Amino acid sequence: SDDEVLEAATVVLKRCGPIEFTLSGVAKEVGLSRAALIQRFTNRDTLLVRMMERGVEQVRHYLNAIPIGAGPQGLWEFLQVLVRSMNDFSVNYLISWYELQVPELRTLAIQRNRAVVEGIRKRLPPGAPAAAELLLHSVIAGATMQWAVDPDGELADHVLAQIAAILCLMFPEHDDFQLL
Amino acid sequence: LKSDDEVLEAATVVLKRCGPIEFTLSGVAKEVGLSRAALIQRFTNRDTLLVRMMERGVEQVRHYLNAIPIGAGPQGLWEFLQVLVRSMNTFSVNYLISWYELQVPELRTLAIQRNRAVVEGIRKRLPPGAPAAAELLLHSVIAGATMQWAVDPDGELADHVLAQIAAILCLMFPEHDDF
């Protein structure tokens, strides 16, 4: 079923991290034999390259479907949508550690982040400070890590409180950012 | 090698090779030059050893932060953030460490004290008129700019991170030189 296989496989990676992720665990999740998974994907790391190659493509593609909206409020609303969409959890710190380990993964991690910085830019209102998009990308990552270490309330509220704080710095003319 | 300090420094020289997952008393004993039985009686197991290494590290963080001279105005905050950024440190094994810390509650408790130390260190350098909870924003920027450069490097880390740090400082303090 071949694309059933990276679906099942992303569920296994989620469950046990990239060090314990094995072709046998995916063959189990998916209902085929290890033997078949080996001749189809050869190894763990080839299979993570594919799943990621596809992961990069669903991102490029979410970003894109978001139509570029109006004003500082366009940016806020977007950032809100982007942040609420992030789904233990320190498993993505294991996942980002391992992405930097396999050059093929590191390439695609680089493509994923570039892509996400680009979509933030595209939403940037006339005259935003230089590199606002990098600054914004940093707060999102940085504030998510804060919360994973020393969590307080929901992730999104923790992150979004700091994005709204940086959006007031960026657009001191606009009225304080909020929502519902 | 006898003293706990000798042991913990030897375990660093070691946990520089292995990461958390593959760290064993076994290797640490080789390094410091005592038997594995002697590390096992002194440290019980590998995560007790990690805990003690961490506790030292966090104490060293708080002492380091307390020893930086509190200056004044937006300028003293910028010189404090410059020192802190250039201090940490030279980083991939560190994300594996940071992951592992979230795994063992004793370590995760130490990870939270560590973060709050560093957050409270920044808050203390906030001059009047810094926005509400600016110390969380500044801490986020340092962490998040760092992961940004981990993935797609470009220049020295501390330069990537400080550019963004100077840029948010100018937004928080718009009259100043600068920065």
Interface size between A and B, measured as CB pairs under 8 A: 115
Q: What is the resolution of this structure in A?
A: 2.1
For every residue of A25-91, DSSP letters joined together read HHHHHHTS-HHHHHHHH-SHHHHHHHHHHHHHHHHHHHHHHS---SHHHHHHHHHHHHHHT----TH
Select from 3.30.565.10, 3.10.580.10, 1.10.10.60, 1.10.357.10 the CATH code of B1-179: 1.10.357.10
Residues 6 or more apart in contact with residue A154 via CB below 8 angstroms:
none
CB atoms within 10 A of CB A13: 24
CB B37 within 8 A of CB B25: no
Exposed / middle / buried, residue B125 (Cβ in 10 Å: 0-12, 13-18, 19+) = buried
CB A51 within 8 A of CB A13: yes
Contacts of residue B131 in chain A, CB cutoff 8 Å? 165, 168-169
CB contact under 8 A, B136 and A146: yes
**Alpha-carbon distance B143 to A103, whole Å?**
23
Chain B residues contacting A via beta carbons under 8 Å? 21, 92, 95-96, 98-99, 101-103, 108, 111-112, 115-116, 131-134, 136-137, 139-145, 147-148, 150-152, 163-164, 167-168, 171-172
Contacts of residue A163 in chain B, CB cutoff 8 Å? none
For every residue of A143-174, DSSP letters joined together read HHHHHHHS--S-HHHHHHHHHHHHHHHH-TTS
Which residue bears the tokens 């030279």? B90
Nearest to B115 among A91, A149, A169 (CB): A149
CATH number of A1-180: 1.10.357.10
**Alpha-carbon distance A131 to A9, whole Å?**
36
Nearest to B96 among A91, A97, A165 (CB): A97
Which residue bears the tokens 């314990």? A20
CB contact under 8 A, B133 and A109: no
Nearest-CA distance A138 → chain B (Å): 4
CB contact under 8 A, A149 and B102: yes
Domain ranges of chain B: 1-179
